[PDB]
Amino acid sequence: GSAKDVKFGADARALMLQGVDLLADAVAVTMGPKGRTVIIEQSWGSPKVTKDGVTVAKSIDLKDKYKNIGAKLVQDVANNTNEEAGDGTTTATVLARSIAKEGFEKISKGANPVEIRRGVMLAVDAVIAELKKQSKPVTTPEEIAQVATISANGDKEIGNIISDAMKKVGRKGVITVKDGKTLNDELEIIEGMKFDRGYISPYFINTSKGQKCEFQDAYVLLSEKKISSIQSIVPALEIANAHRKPLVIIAEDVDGEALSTLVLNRLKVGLQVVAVKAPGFGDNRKNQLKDMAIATGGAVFGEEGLTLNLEDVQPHDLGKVGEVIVTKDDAMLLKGKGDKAQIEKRIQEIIEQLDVTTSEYEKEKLNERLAKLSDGVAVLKVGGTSDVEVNEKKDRVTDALNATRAAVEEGIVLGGGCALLRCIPALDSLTPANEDQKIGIEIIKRTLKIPAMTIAKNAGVEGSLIVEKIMQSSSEVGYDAMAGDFVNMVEKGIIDPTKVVRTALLDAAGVASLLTTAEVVVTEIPK
Amino acid sequence: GSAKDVKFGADARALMLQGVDLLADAVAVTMGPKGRTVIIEQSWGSPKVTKDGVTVAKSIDLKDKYKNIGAKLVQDVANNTNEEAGDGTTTATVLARSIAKEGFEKISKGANPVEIRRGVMLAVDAVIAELKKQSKPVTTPEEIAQVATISANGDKEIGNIISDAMKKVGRKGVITVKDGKTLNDELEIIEGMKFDRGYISPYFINTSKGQKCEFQDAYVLLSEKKISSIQSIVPALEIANAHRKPLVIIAEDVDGEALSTLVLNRLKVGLQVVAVKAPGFGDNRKNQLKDMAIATGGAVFGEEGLTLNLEDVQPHDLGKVGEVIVTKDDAMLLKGKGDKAQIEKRIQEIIEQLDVTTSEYEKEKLNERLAKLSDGVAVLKVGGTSDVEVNEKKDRVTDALNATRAAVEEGIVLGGGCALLRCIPALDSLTPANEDQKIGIEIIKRTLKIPAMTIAKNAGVEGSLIVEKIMQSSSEVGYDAMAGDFVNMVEKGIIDPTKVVRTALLDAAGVASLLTTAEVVVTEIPK
Amino acid sequence: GSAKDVKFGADARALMLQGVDLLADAVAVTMGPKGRTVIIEQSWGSPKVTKDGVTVAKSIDLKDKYKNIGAKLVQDVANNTNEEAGDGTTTATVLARSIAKEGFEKISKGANPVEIRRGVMLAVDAVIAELKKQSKPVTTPEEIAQVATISANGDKEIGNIISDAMKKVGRKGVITVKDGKTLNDELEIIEGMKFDRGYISPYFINTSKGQKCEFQDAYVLLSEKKISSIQSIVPALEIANAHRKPLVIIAEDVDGEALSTLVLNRLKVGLQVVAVKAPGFGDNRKNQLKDMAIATGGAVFGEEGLTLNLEDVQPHDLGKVGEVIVTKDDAMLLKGKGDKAQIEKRIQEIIEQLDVTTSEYEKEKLNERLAKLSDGVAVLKVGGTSDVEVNEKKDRVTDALNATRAAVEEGIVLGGGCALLRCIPALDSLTPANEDQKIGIEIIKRTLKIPAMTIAKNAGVEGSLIVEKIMQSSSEVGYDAMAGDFVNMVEKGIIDPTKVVRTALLDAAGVASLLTTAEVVVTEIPK
Ligand SMILES: Nc1ncnc2c1ncn2[C@@H]1O[C@H](COP(=O)(O)OP(=O)(O)OP(=O)(O)O)[C@@H](O)[C@H]1O
Ligand SMILES: Nc1ncnc2c1ncn2[C@@H]1O[C@H](COP(=O)(O)OP(=O)(O)OP(=O)(O)O)[C@@H](O)[C@H]1O
Ligand SMILES: Nc1ncnc2c1ncn2[C@@H]1O[C@H](COP(=O)(O)OP(=O)(O)OP(=O)(O)O)[C@@H](O)[C@H]1O
Ligand SMILES: [K+]
Ligand SMILES: [K+]
Ligand SMILES: [K+]
Ligand SMILES: [Mg+2]
Numbered sequence A, B, C: 001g002s003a004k005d006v007k008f009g010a011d012a013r014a015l016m017l018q019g020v021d022l023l024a025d026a027v028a029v030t031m032g033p034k035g036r037t038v039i040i041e042q043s044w045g046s047p048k049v050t051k052d053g054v055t056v057a058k059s060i061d062l063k064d065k066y067k068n069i070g071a072k073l074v075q076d077v078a079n080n081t082n083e084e085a086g087d088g089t090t091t092a093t094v095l096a097r098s099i100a101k102e103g104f105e106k107i108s109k110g111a112n113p114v115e116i117r118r119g120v121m122l123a124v125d126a127v128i129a130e131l132k133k134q135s136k137p138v139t140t141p142e143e144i145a146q147v148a149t150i151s152a153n154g155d156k157e158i159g160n161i162i163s164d165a166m167k168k169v170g171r172k173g174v175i176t177v178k179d180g181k182t183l184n185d186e187l188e189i190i191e192g193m194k195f196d197r198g199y200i201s202p203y204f205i206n207t208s209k210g211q212k213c214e215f216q217d218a219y220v221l222l223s224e225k226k227i228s229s230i231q232s233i234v235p236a237l238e239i240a241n242a243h244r245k246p247l248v249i250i251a252e253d254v255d256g257e258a259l260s261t262l263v264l265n266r267l268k269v270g271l272q273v274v275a276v277k278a279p280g281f282g283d284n285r286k287n288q289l290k291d292m293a294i295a296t297g298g299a300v301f302g303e304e305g306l307t308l309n310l311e312d313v314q315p316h317d318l319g320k321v322g323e324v325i326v327t328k329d330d331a332m333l334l335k336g337k338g339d340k341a342q343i344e345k346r347i348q349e350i351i352e353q354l355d356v357t358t359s360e361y362e363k364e365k366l367n368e369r370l371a372k373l374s375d376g377v378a379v380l381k382v383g384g385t386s387d388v389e390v391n392e393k394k395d396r397v398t399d400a401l402n403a404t405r406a407a408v409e410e411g412i413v414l415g416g417g418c419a420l421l422r423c424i425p426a427l428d429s430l431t432p433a434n435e436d437q438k439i440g441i442e443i444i445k446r447t448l449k450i451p452a453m454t455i456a457k458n459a460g461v462e463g464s465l466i467v468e469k470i471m472q473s474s475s476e477v478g479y480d481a482m483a484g485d486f487v488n489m490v491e492k493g494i495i496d497p498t499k500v501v502r503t504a505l506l507d508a509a510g511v512a513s514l515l516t517t518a519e520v521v522v523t524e525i526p527k
C-alpha cells in the first residue's frame, strides 16, 4: 500500500554493494590477533567496545534503503554464523562480501546468475568435504587450551581457565560465564546439588561464623506439596529425634504452624532441623525434587500420581546425605546416599530426554539437571575495573567457550585461514557443467584466500604475498600474524574448529550467491 | 467528497501505460530458466528475494495515482492468475502489458474500444479452444516429474521429490510444504491416523528411549465428552484388564479423578493405559472422532444424538489397533481393525461432502480427513542455510506443486510459450464482424508471441528471431532457452499445464481489454 | 534499527579525544589546593558550585555523539573512582585523558593497540606494587587529621572535627554528614541506643522544661507485637508498681485500650510509665528490639518462634536501664543493665553478619546496630549561610571522610602526586615483551607525572620544572603548592591514601587503554 521506488540492474547492485562494503569494512578491522575494536554508542548510557563481528554487524543500519538491504543481508550472514557456531562471524562477513563483490562483477547480459549460484554451492560442497577430510579430532586438553586461547584473541589465561573448567566438569559439562567484582578472572566449581533457595526461618542457623546451617549425615524429607498441617510434620520429627540425626525438609513451602513447630523444637529442646523451599517453578521443580530423591535415596511425598502422604513416614523413606550447607541465599547437598543403579537410570532417562527437544530452553534445564546428577557445574567470573572492560572480555570468553565446544564435537583444522587455503586444489579438481558454474567455482576459489588476506592485512603486512608464500609452502606451514613468522601451525597452537570454518563458509555463500542473482530492487519511498 | 483530478484521453492513457510498464518491467526479468530475482525490502527485518511474479507485482505501488491505477490493474491480473492456478503470474503480467499497450496504440477518433474488447475476447475464446484441442493428458509419473521440474526453475530434485510424494500419497493426496532445519530438502510420509495431541500425563511413558508410549494390539476408547468421574472409566479398565490388552483413551479431556485412577493403575499394578486429548476445536473434533471410531471399529461415547454412556461398555464397543505411538506432541494410530465397508462408506460420504462446500477452509479439513482415512499425507521440508533462501525455494516448491496439480487435473501442452505460438493459425481462421473486432483479433495475435519472446530475451538472445524460427519449424519443435537450442519439447520435458496457460491468457485479456476502453481517469488530489 | 553513522580511524579518534579533552579540561581546574570551582546549572532552581571531579564529569554531555562517547568513557572513569574509593576523581580524570591522548598518538599501521593495552596494564601492575611497597600504615590521630585536612582542600577545622569524631566513636565507627542551621560546623555524639520514635501520648511528659519524659533506673518492657488489650499490659504495671520503679514500654504500637489504661494510671494515681513505638519497618525492627533486649537485659515479648506472651511477665524478664530520655521525635536508653558477655556475643554475631552482605543497604543497617551497641554514632553538621555554600562544603567533608576511611584501611603515601612520581624507576626496571608493550610502558611512564604537573599548573607555576626538581630531589621531598616551596611532605602533612591513588590509576588505565584500541566508531544519526 505504501509508495515504492524500483531500481534495475547495475545501479541497484552498486548501491547494495556499497551497503555490504560499509558493513564488511566496519567488521573486518576486528579480524585476527592484530585486529582492533569497534565502539558502538548505546542510547541508555556507556558505549560498548567490542571485537565481535556479529555485534558490529547487528549494530549498523543505513539511511539509504538500497544500501540497508545489503547491510541486512550481511547481518543475516553474521547472525546465522553466530547462532550455528557461536564464533567465526567476522570470517563469514568477509567471505560474504567477497562472494557478493565477485558475483556482482561477473553479471553480464549472457550470464545466468542462478547457475552461477549453483556453481558456487557445488564448490562450497567440495570445500566442505575437503575440510572434513583434513580435520582431526581433539584428544588432549592442551589442544583444548590452544583452541580456547586462539579464540580469545591470544589470551592464554582464558584458555587455561577454560581448559581447567573442562578438566573438572567434563568436556560436555555445563560452564556459565558471568561478571566478577574482582580485577582477575576466577573459576568456581559447584559440585553436588546446589540450588538457589535459602532458609525459610533465619533461626535455623547453627554455625554463626558464616551465618549458615551445617549438618553431617542428615536425613532428608522431600515434599511435592507445601507442608501445612502439624500432623504432616510430627512423624518425620519423631523419626529424626528417635534416631538422633538431623533433618532437612525440602518442600514447596512451609506454613506458619509447621514453621512454629520447627522453630520451637529448635529453640527450646534443640532439634537439628532446617527447612528449605523447593527450587523451580512448575514441572522443573518436580523434576528437581525427583532428582534429589534419587540422589539422596528417598521418596518425594505429595505425589500427584502416587499419592504418598506425609503422615506415614518410614526411616527407609527418608533420604540421607553426609553434608548439607544451607545459606540465606542458597542450599547444597553433598554425598547423598542414593542407590547408584537408580542414579544411572535417571541419568540415562535425562540423556534420552535430551534427544527429543527443540525448544532450546528445556535443553538447558535438562543439562543442568544432568550436571547436578554428575560432577557439577563451572562458573567463570570475568574480571575488570569497569563494566565496558568486563563486557569486552566476556564476549571473548563466550567466543572461546563456543569454539572449544565446537572443537570437542567436530575436531580441529589449521588456523589463520590456512584451512580454506588448503582446499583450493579440491576446487582445481572440479569439472564445471557449463560456463556459469565455472564462474561460480572461480568465485569461490578467489574467495578462499580472503580470511588469510584479511588477517595479514590487519597485521600491517601485504596479505597477497603472505597467502602466496603459504600456498607455496608445505601443508603444515602457515603464517603466525602475531609473531609475523611462517610456522608449523599445529605445533604453535594456531588451530580452528572445523565446525566454525564450514559454518562461516556455508552461511556466507548461501546468502551472498542469492544476493548476486538480483536484477530489480524494490524499496519504500522514505517519508 | 474529496477533491478530485480528472484527466482525458491520451495523457491519462500514457500515464496508466507508464504504471503498467513499470510493474511489467519489474516482473518480466524473472521469467524463464534464465530469469533473475527481485529483492523487496520488508519493513520489519530481512528483505525478501523472489522469482515469483505475483510477489513482485503485489509489492509495487506508485506515488503517481494515474500510474498507480494501471499498476493496481496489472496487480489484479497477477493476483487472479495466482488464485485460479497458482502459477503463470509472470506470463499473465507480460500478456496483460502487451494487450494494454497494443490497445492503447489502436485508439483513435473513429475507433470503438468496446468492440475492440469484444474482438479480443472472441480471439481469446478461439485460442483457449485451440489450447484445449492440442492438450494431452498426463499418464506417467515421468511427466509429473517433468512438470514439477520445469515449474521449479529447472530443479530436478524438487521435481523428483514431488513425483515421489505423489507416487506415495496419490495424485489427489495432501502434500504440505514447510521449512526445514536441515540444509537439504526432505519428504516425510505420515501414514495412518496421526494427530497433534500428545499424552496427558507423563507417567504413561513405557518406552523412554524416545520418550514415547508404545503399545501393540491395543483397545481404543473414544469419547465425545470429557471423562471426569471414576465410574466413567472403571468398566473400560475392567475390560482391558480382563482381556489383558492395552487401552488408549481418546477423549475431549481427562479430569483429575480419572487421571489419578489411570496414573495409579499405571504405576502401582502396571496397567497398560494411555490418555490422549481429542484433536480439533469444535465440529471437526467430533468428525475426527467418528472417523477414528470407523477406522478402529469402535463407537464414540457421549454422542449428542445417540446418547451413549461410558458406564456400560462392551468389549465389541471398543475399537482395536495393531500399534499406537503416543509422543509428547503427537499421537498416531496404526493398523485399525475397523470394517472395510464402513470405512469406504465414510470415505464416500467425505467425498460427497466436498462437492457441496466452497468455504476453502472446510475443504482443507475434509481433504485432511480423507487423507487420514485412505493414504496419509506428505510433508515437504524445504532446506537452506538462511530464511531468505528457504523462502525463495519454498516459493518455487509451491509453484511446482500448483503446476503439477493443474497438470493432473487438466493435462499438459508445450512449454516455453510455444503452446500460445501454435494457436496463431486458429486466429488466422477467424472472420471478424467489423473493423474494431479485427483490431482486437490482431491485438491478441500479436500478444501471443510475447511469452516466448520474453523467455528468449531473458536468455540473452534476440527473441523475435527465436519466435520466427519456432513458427517456421514443426509443431513439436520449440526453443530450449536453458540449453539455447531447438529441440523436441515433449522429449526434453519442457511442458506446461494447459490450465495455467489458459488462466494466464484469460485473466490478462479480461482486465487489459477493459483498461483499453477508458477515456476519462479520475484520481484524488494528493494531500 | 535506527540509522547509523560510522567513522574510521584518525577522524573518529580525534573527535573522541576532543570529547575527552573538554571533559578533562573542565575537571582539571579543580585539582589541588589552588584549584577553582565549577558552577553547574540545575533545572529546578539554584546552581551548584562544586570542586568535586565526578560532579563536574557527570554533569557534562555533548551534542556531538563522537565527542560524547569519549565524555561518557571519562565519566565512567570518574564514577568508578568515586564508587570504589570516594576520592581521587580529578586525578583519575587527568590520568585517563593522558593515557587516552598518548595512546591515540602512538597508533600507526604497524601498531597493535591491544598489545599496547597489555603493556599499559603490566606497567600499572608494577606501579601499584611499588605504591604498596612504599606505603605505611596510619598509627596516630595526627595523621588522621592531616589526611582529612588535605582531602578537605586544606581546611584544618574539618580535619580536626573528623579526627575528634574518629577519636570518640572509633576509626571504624559510624559518622554521618548532614546540613546545619548554624554558620559554623558542629559535631554531635549520640551514645547509647537512640532511635527515631518519640512518645505515643503527650501526657507521659514528666519534665516540661524540655517537653520530655525523664526517668532514672527504669524497667523496660519490649514487645514484638502490638500491645492492645488490658490483660496484655496489667501485670507489667503490677510488678512496676510493686517494685516502685518506672516503666518504658517499647512496642510495635499501643492501641486505645492499653493507652487509655496507661494515661489514666499516670494522670490519676501517679504511675511512672511511658510508651514508645518500635523503630524500623520489617526485620530490622525485630533485630533492633533484640539488640535492645540484649543491651537492657530483658526478653522480647511476642516472639514469632518462641511465643512469649505478655500475660506472664516476671521481674527478671523485664530489662533495666539507668536512665531513659523520651522526647517528641526521639527516645534513647542509657546504661542498660544487660549481661556483658551476651552483648559481646550479639556484637560478634553482627560482625559475622557483616562478613556476608552485598546489598550495601543492609550493611549500613548492621553497622548502625553495631554502633548503637558499642560506641554510638557521630553526626557532622556542616555550616553555611546559604544552601549552595553548605553543599559545596559538604562535598569536601564527604571527600575527607572517604579519604580518612581509606587511609585507616590501607595506609598513606606521599601527597601532591609525588607517590606516582616515585614509581617511575619501577617502570625503568621493566623488560617489555615486544615493541607495543614497550609503547604502553612508556605511555604509563609519561602519564605518571600528570597529577603533580596539574597541581603545579593550577598554582600558576610551570609544572614540568616542578616535576623535574621533585624527581631530582630526595624521596621524602615534594612540592607544597600551597606555600609554593619544596618541603618534607610527611612532616608537612601533605599525604594521600594509598587506596585512592591506586584506585584512580587503575580505573583511568583500564578504560583509557581500551578506548585507545578502537578503529571504528558507530553512532546514531541525530534526529
Ligand atoms: N596468531 C595468529 N596467527 C594467525 N592467525 C591467527 C592467530 N590467532 C588467531 N588467528 C586466526 O584469526 C581468526 C580469528 O579472528 P577473530 O576471532 O577476530 O574472528 P572470527 O573468529 O572470524 O569471528 P568473531 O569476531 O565472531 O570472533 C581465525 O581464523 C584464527 O585462526
Ligand atoms: N528450459 C526451458 N526452455 C524454454 N522454456 C522454458 C524452460 N524452462 C521453463 N520454460 C518456460 O518458462 C516459463 C516459466 O517461467 P516462470 O515460471 O518464471 O513464470 P510464470 O510461470 O509465468 O510465473 P510464476 O512467476 O508465477 O512462476 C514457462 O512458459 C515454461 O514453459
Ligand atoms: N598543599 C598541597 N601541596 C601539594 N599538593 C597538595 C596540597 N594539598 C593537596 N595536594 C594534593 O592535591 C590532590 C588533591 O586534589 P583534589 O582533592 O582537588 O582532587 P582529587 O583527590 O583527585 O579528586 P576529587 O575532586 O574527587 O576530590 C592530592 O594529590 C593531594 O595530595
Ligand atoms: K573479530
Ligand atoms: K517468474
Ligand atoms: K578537585
Ligand atoms: Mg573468534
Ligand SMILES: [Mg+2]
Binding pocket: B087, B088, B151, B152, B399
Ligand atoms: Mg512458474
Ligand SMILES: [Mg+2]
Binding pocket: C087, C088, C151, C152, C399
Ligand atoms: Mg580530594
